[PDB]
């Protein structure tokens, strides 16, 4: 009808209330654009808020079918919980989302971790990275003979606005989607100008990329830059680059067979959404100086193994905030910057 004509737009989750009349359609009179929490679960998450051993067991309890890789799932835990999404006054917004790229030999469970992060998040969209019918994930053009005109189709990234998206086989993805995510990273948004339209979209969509080398295998003695098969701008776009090695070693490889031959799922979802909705962390002077010292000490890596960018400054406190909201404290601590520096030492060296 006339009344509710200005409250509908494509891409949003909606709940309509109408009458199923068949002259089959519904006469929609009420539209609402959009896990339950009890008072017993809040006592459990308040009981688990002050123990200083919570983070390691919560990172170890997400995937018991995958042996090892504790710091990678520590960053994946900090990745799926989120950031803060700070909106500046009379200026551009600030990126709160974090992005993770994972490389290594194709022998491990990188393709088995996406199914776990797709089935255990709040909302997640996974794509293969190659095979999109449109121009990519974000959109596509179509012709309709009903109106005799051209309409817009929204393939992916525009659907999930606050959740996470997962792209496996990142090296097979073409340059058009690379130019689009070049905009995606810095933007935490996207822009499109096409025959008859110009616009910009802003839906939160933290990316989880999984790639493979072009040589098939990789070892420590080879250089760590050409094995990646990606440009330096994409290395600067992604925040944490995790390298997983699989050289055959008789000491470590003895217990994988008995481990795979041998806290829960509905609790961490409620934990992540209560941290996302209630507590926003702020900075302190105890965690500014140690991250200033860490950034100035690394800006070492430029002469030894990896480039340092301006953005990385932002990503070095995003993670801290993350840890500070994993413990759901109202402000940050020095140990959050320390565990972010430990994650940096594991993912950089």
């Amino acid at each position: 009808d006339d009344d509710l004509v200005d409250k509908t737009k494509p891409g949003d989750r909606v709940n309509v209330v109408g009458v199923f009349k068949s002259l089959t359609l519904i006469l929609g009179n009420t539209v609402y654009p959009l896990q339950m929490l009890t008072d017993f679960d809040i006592r459990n998450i308040n009981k688990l808020s002050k123990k200083k051993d919570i983070f390691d067991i919560l990172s170890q309890s997400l995937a018991p079918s995958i042996y090892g890789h504790d710091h990678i799932k520590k960053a994946i835990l900090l990745m799926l919980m989120g950031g803060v999404e700070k909106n500046l006054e009379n200026g551009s917004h600030l990126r709160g989302d974090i992005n993770i790229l994972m490389v290594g030999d194709p022998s491990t469970a990188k393709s088995q971790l996406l199914r776990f992060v797709l089935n255990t998040a709040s909302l997640a969209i996974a794509t293969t990275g190659r095979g999109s019918s449109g121009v990519g994930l974000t959109a596509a053009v179509t012709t309709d003979r009903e109106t005799g005109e051209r309409r817009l189709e929204a393939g992916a990234m525009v659907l999930a606005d606050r959740g996470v998206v997962c792209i496996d086989e990142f090296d097979k993805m073409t340059d058009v989607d690379r130019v689009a995510i070049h905009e995606v990273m810095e933007q935490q948004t996207v822009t499109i100008a096409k025959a008859g339209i110009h616009t910009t979209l802003n839906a939160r969509c933290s990316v989880i990329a999984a790639a493979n080398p072009v040589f098939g295998q990789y070892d420590v003695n080879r250089d760590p830059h050409q094995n990646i098969a990606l440009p330096d701008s994409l290395l600067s776009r992604f925040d944490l680059l995790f390298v997983v090695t699989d050289d055959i070693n008789e000491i470590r490889d003895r217990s994988i067979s008995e481990h795979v031959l041998r806290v829960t799922i509905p609790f961490l979802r409620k934990y992540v959404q209560y941290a996302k909705e209630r507590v926003i962390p702020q900075l302190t002077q105890e965690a500014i100086n140690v991250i200033v010292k860490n950034y100035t000490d690394l800006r070492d890596d430029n002469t030894k193994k990896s480039p340092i960018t301006a953005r990385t400054l932002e990503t070095l406190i995003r993670l801290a905030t993350a840890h500070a909201k994993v413990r759901l404290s109202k402000t940050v601590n020095k140990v959050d910057a320390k565990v972010a520096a430990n994650l940096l030492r594991f993912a950089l060296l």
Partner: protein, 166 residues
């Protein structure tokens, strides 16, 4: 007419992110509105000219990502001479690691990530409407150059040409 992006943005700022990641077909149309603001197309559909004003803003990176001090800037920049010869202002925003100046950038990003407020300087940041009104009021002005500034302009141009004229 269904222009790429140069036709819905007629009188304003047209920006390009990742300028060296484009192709020759994009460059031949960008240089044509950069020199003369009047794209002309003569194909089996039409032979017509579309006129628009676009203060081309471009953001680019070099060949190896960052700069190179052992390389010349004509070899560091992959763009041809006619492209940057038309470009009057090129900004070499190069980062240099330091001990004192890097702390202010770190203090500023931790201050804007701590809260949305800007630093406590004795100045207040103006909202978009007031300087938008100032730009719209200043755009109707038509300044005329004098003769005392003319004799400085021609002497500086002669000295700049001789200094630039390897």
């Amino acid at each position: 007419l269904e222009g790429g992006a140069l036709v819905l943005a007629d009188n304003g700022i047209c920006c390009i992110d990742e300028f060296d990641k484009m192709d020759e077909s994009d460059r031949t149309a960008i240089h044509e509105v950069m020199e003369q603001q009047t794209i002309s197309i003569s194909k089996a559909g039409i032979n017509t000219t579309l006129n628009a004003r676009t203060s081309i803003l471009a953001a680019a990176n070099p060949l190896y990502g960052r700069y190179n001090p052992r390389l010349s800037p004509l070899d560091n920049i992959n763009l041809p001479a006619a492209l940057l010869s038309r470009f009057d202002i090129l900004f070499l925003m190069l980062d240099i690691p330091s001990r004192d100046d890097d702390e202010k950038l770190a203090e500023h990003v931790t201050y804007v990530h701590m809260h949305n407020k800007q630093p406590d300087l004795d100045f207040t940041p103006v909202e978009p409407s007031k300087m938008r009104e100032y730009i719209a009021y200043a755009k109707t002005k038509r300044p005329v150059m004098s003769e005392a500034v003319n004799d400085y302009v021609v002497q500086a141009y002669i000295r700049l040409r001789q200094d630039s004229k390897d």
